[PDB]
Amino acid sequence: LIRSVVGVVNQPIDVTVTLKLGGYEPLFTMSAQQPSIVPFTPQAYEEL
Amino acid sequence: IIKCSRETEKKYPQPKGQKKKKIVKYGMGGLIILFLIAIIWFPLLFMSLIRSVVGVVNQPIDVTVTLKLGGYEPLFTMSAQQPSIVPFTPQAYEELSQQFDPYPLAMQFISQYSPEDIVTAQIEGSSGALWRISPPSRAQMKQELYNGTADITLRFTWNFQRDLAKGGTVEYTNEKHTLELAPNSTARRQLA
Amino acid sequence: KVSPPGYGIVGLYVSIVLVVGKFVRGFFSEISHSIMFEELPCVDRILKLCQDIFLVRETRELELEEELYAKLIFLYRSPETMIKWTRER
Amino acid sequence: VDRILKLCQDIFLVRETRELELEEELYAKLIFLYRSPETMIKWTRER
Amino acid sequence: VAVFRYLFWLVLVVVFVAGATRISIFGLGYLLACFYLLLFGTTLLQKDTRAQLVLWDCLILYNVTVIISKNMLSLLSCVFVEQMQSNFCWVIQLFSLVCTVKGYYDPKEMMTRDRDCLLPVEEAGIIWDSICFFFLLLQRRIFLSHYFLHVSADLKATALQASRGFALYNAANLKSINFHRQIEEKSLAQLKRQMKRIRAKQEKYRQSQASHMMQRVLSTMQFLWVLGQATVDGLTRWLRAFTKHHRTMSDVLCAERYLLTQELLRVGEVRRGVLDQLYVGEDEATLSGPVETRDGPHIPELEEAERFEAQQGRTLRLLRAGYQCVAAHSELLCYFIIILNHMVTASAASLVLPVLVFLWAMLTIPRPSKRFWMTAIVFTEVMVVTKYLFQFGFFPWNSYVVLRRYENKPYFPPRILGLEKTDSYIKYDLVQLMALFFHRSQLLCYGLWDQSFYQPLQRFFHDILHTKYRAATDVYALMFLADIVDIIIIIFGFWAQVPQAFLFMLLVQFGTMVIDRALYLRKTVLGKLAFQVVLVVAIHIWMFFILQNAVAQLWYFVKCIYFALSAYQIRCGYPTRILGNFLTKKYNHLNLFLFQGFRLVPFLVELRAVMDWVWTDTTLSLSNWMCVEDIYANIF
């Protein structure tokens, strides 16, 4: 009854980015999503 | 304890003979029986702690709709809301039970729902939203249609705001519904 | 619809009904063992002996405490002397 | 243990026939049989 | 003899099937002809060929007119949609106006139109009409045979033997009641002896007070053939001992039927002279069955008949023993199907019979009367006819769109009363009719069909219930087994707004068990009458009017077994010696393990000891009662 389904990955769906100059509007809402959200190759682990 | 029992037997002697007990049998024996059946009976409590407030309907608040042409901006954010979100009449159940005759699974799995479970969302097709542009987004949509042969993916996404005051934890439920656009297809040519 | 909150908990019902079942069977099934110490007639002499031990515990004449306590232990080591010492008369 | 089944079945049929003085006197025989293990040795020989 | 004696009632079954499975006015005529012949068959077979053949020709002429009128109404196969939506009192579903021939309007493909629609699944129906026509003409060949001239001559001797069959019932019942009389007198003599033994001992105490293939071919021969065949032969032996009480008197009446046919061969009777040499020249075999035969006043063919049916071989001799068990114990079989179709059909009109079973078929002390079996037969015939009606889509509660509305809903009052338009609308009512008429045929074969208005019936009803000297049995062990199996089924019913109803079942089950030990220990027949009456009424209300589910049906089957046993202890009285525990009798090995397994259940020994203290009438306290029964449990 302890530590059964531990291991499912939190691969995200969307990533947004803003830039607010002070108390005014953001310059960007870049919701970077799939397929532009790309996981790693093992060569990317080699790169790191 | 023994001495006090013997002295009450002395002070109040029952007749030394064939004395059937009158009602103390029902006084303490029936007490023991009812108490012991109650010990068998607490699965009343064990089943009253299960399935109590099951039945509150997930009638949604908002329904949004997008259409993203590839990695660029959506063409729509049509947050269809109340009062354009309309629940059913029982005649709408009659309409579904009449329009889905030649499938048995359709009749069964619509009849599983209550007279409040199934709600419309009359989505306006006329957005009041300026489609935002940029000459990179302008030109590269034109390039992906005219020159680009790579498959452009068109999504169709949803939202559902549900009452957290009506119980439940999951507010939003969404799915992406992607169709791809082939090169030299009719769809890309008409969009170009 | 909303369900805001079996098989692993009805077994704990059977657990607690067995525990209370043998708990009530404590009160039964083994009191023939206790007949020889509770179903006895006139108990005047043993209250005399126990109250003797209590006042001897007051007056600090503790040799009398040990000798009267040897009388208690031997009265509870021999049920035929329990029959002698607890007649009715 | 034949004699004590004789005594217990005596108590049961006396409970039927409502001659309850015999019930009390046979029950005094049971209590005294369970108050004196040397009479338990007498009353439960083999023979 | 299978054909020429038993394949006549099979014809009436086929007449009932042709009425049932294809529904029309002419099918209703098949039903009424089946009901009339099931009533009057025992006198139809005893007629002569100048009258029984006239009635039979009326039946054949009816079937031919059914076929030809269906041709006359196959006229309306062409002109069909003209008469359809115009209300001619909706004449299509009267006669089931539908065709079968391919080169026409193509039925069950224009079923897609639904507003005032037809019924395709009941076709022209000439299949079962032709099958009945085969059986009718085959019986005409049978009634025109010499084989039926032997069979009807055999039946008339049973019509004479009705009186002596009732005499043999009187002989066995007087012998059984006097047998229980000897048992009760010897038992009370034993209690007188033992009470004097106790008193003599304690008056002495008053005076003392005053002072190779074969290694496994052996297995696949012995454990294949011989051990299984020994168990099958043991089941035949068990059923032979189960119905010897009927087999012996049937064999005695068989021998006398042989001699009565040899007396009926030229005359009617002669002073019952065939009864003079029958029981006298064979009296040892006529001693176990007959008792008072000689007080009021050898056959070789039956000898070789028995000698050549004793070598039938297994799985036909077993079938013969099974059919003798069915023919003997047929009151319980009629009760079994009266319960069984009510277990399936949960209606309010199928409640009418088992309430009357548990309160008036089981509570008449010798036997159920003429009046109950005629009531059961007439009510099943009424129920067949009224369920045959309302299979028509005439009235708007029978229509199909509102049927889709009220699908699987126990609030629709025809579904509550039992008027469902399902294809298997007769669930077990066909089996119930053949069971009721077969039991009527057995009781007709023997001698069995003999503020101010409620009082001379019911006061005499309880006068039957409280003055006969009948028997002495104790069925409380079996009643309590059925109550435990009820608890097991209800706890299995929690393995499923429905589980809040099994809880109230548990409270009422515990309440009924408590009142059962009360009435059992106090021997109150009057209280047990009122308790069974209130249980039959309240359970049959609370289950069917308020709450299908298989575990609820199975709980009902065990509970109605329990009603049968409680009514069987309404009759046959209470013995005058309850005698404590039922496992403390035999002192066996398995008896020991059942006793310890009884004490392993948590809350039975407590309740047994407490309730036996409360409802008996002793001088002991509660702790003294516990001391005695703990001593007795350890010593057993």
Author numbering:
A (entry chain E): 2212 to 2259
B (entry chain C): 2164 to 2355
C (entry chain C): 2452 to 2456, 2463 to 2546
D (entry chain E): 2500 to 2546
E (entry chain E): 1155 to 1365, 1493 to 1578, 1655 to 1807, 1952 to 1997, 2015 to 2065, 2075 to 2163
List passages from the publication reporting this PDB structure.
Piezo ion channels, Piezo1 and Piezo2, are mechanosensitive channels (MS channels) that underlie force-detection in eukaryotic cells. The number of cellular processes found mediated by Piezo channels is large and growing at a rapid rate. Their essential biophysical characteristics include responsiveness in gating to mechanical force (i.e. mechanosensitivity) and selectivity of the pore for cations. Biophysical studies suggest that Piezo channels sense force directly through the lipid membrane, although other mechanisms also have been proposed. Viewed down its 3-fold axis, the trimeric Piezo channel is a triskelion with extended arms; from the side, it is curved as shown.
Using cryo-electron microscopy (cryo-EM) we determined a structure of mPiezo1 to an overall resolution of 3.7 Å. The refined structural model contains 1518 residues (out of 2547), with the N-terminal 576 residues and internal flexible loops missing. The structure’s extended arms consist of 24 helices arranged as six repeated 4-TM structural units. The six 4-TM repeats assemble with each other also as a left-handed helix, causing the extended arms of the triskelion to spiral away from the trimer’s center, out of plane with respect to the central pore axis. At the center TM37-38 form a 3-fold symmetric channel lined by TM38, capped on the extracellular side by a CED, and extended on the intracellular side by a pore extension (PE) helix. The cuff consists of ‘elbow’ helices (residues 2116 to 2142), a ‘base’ helix (residues 2149 to 2175) and ‘hairpin' helices (residues 2501 to 2534) from all three subunits. The transmembrane pore, lined by TM38 and the PE helix, is closed. At the level of the membrane inner leaflet, the pore radius at positions E2537, P2536 and M2493 is 0.1 Å, 0.4 Å and 0.3 Å, respectively. However, the detergent micelle containing a trimer is curved into a dome shape. A negatively charged patch of amino acids (E2257, E2258 and D2264) on the CED lies in close contact with a positively charged patch (R1761, R1762 and R1269) located in the extracellular loops of 4-TM units 2 and 3.
